[PDB]
């Protein structure tokens, strides 16, 4: 309802006026299937899917990671309907 319906069926959202949720985060114990769930969503929706381990986006070059994620979102906007998946987001989303 949060990721598939807004994508495949937007006219409900624009006519009704609902802003579709930008994204959803999955949390739970290890081995509960969050990554599996993301894989299923990727496999079954005929779309453009983006998945990258958060640890890999970090680069040792000055400011390379910010340009990396900027270009990822630029590609997603370019290649709609695009879906970007974050696994182990706490690698970069951790507290300051």
């Amino acid at each position: 309802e949060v990721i598939e319906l807004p994508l495949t069926n937007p006219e409900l959202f624009q006519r009704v006026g609902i802003i579709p949720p930008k994204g959803c985060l999955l949390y739970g114990p290890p081995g509960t299937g969050k990554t599996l769930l993301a894989r299923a969503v990727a496999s079954q929706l005929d779309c453009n899917f983006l998945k990258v381990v958060s640890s890999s986006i970090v680069d040792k070059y000055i400011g390379e990671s910010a340009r990396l994620i900027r270009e990822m979102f630029n590609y997603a906007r370019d290649h709609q309907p695009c879906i970007i998946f974050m696994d182990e987001i706490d690698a970069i989303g951790g507290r300051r």
Partner: protein
Amino acid sequence: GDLVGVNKDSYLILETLPTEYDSRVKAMEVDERPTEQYSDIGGLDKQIQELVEAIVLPMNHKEKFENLGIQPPKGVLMYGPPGTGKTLLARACAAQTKATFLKLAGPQLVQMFIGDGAKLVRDAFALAKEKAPSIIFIDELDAIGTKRDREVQRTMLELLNQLDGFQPNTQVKVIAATNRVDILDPALLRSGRLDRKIEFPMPNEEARARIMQIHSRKMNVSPDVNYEELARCTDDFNGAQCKAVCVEAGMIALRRGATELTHEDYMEGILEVQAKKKANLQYYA
């Protein structure tokens, strides 16, 4: 993301190149192919069979698994108190399986720069993929496997997802060794990641006797050495401690000038290897 040689001035691609992972990553692979036989390990036969059925059998056949329909194990965390045959068993698995073997230690993936560790982890997994029948051995997980610095966390997250998430397996099998399983807890030890958890116990009486016999084969020992009594006296002794007992017996035989070591040398070596028994504590008397 391909490696191409271009014109040095006009930048025209005029050669394709094999992808280069890293010099360190190329250092991690095994080329010497050690020679420790499985018979050289004593007492650990059950654990040896566990590791073999987990790793080698998926390599050799793949038919007995598919005929069932099972997913072969892709993660083996081998563990026990230091002094058992953990690293020895990993070395023997490298010796016998003829596979392209990736040996390494946990600190090797730490590195200095922020984004490097994930890059070595990814490149080692990629090299294992390219060498397809490949085995990755990780030693000292607790160096990076510590439960929740920040970069070590990044490296171990990269290890977690290049091993469990988004189409793993193909033909890469990992072997993990550590002494502090309590440290790693939630992240790696997941059943999906390391399917087998092989405990290496404090070696048994007969296991200890077998260990001393294995280490003393070449010693030209006395024809009458009571291995059973040595095992009885060497309670709490680990396999490394038993090897030290044999070595110390050889040294004591040298200090006597004897051409063959005997039993008395074995008690002397046992006294050498054993702890200091602390001291009598008046607390309890």
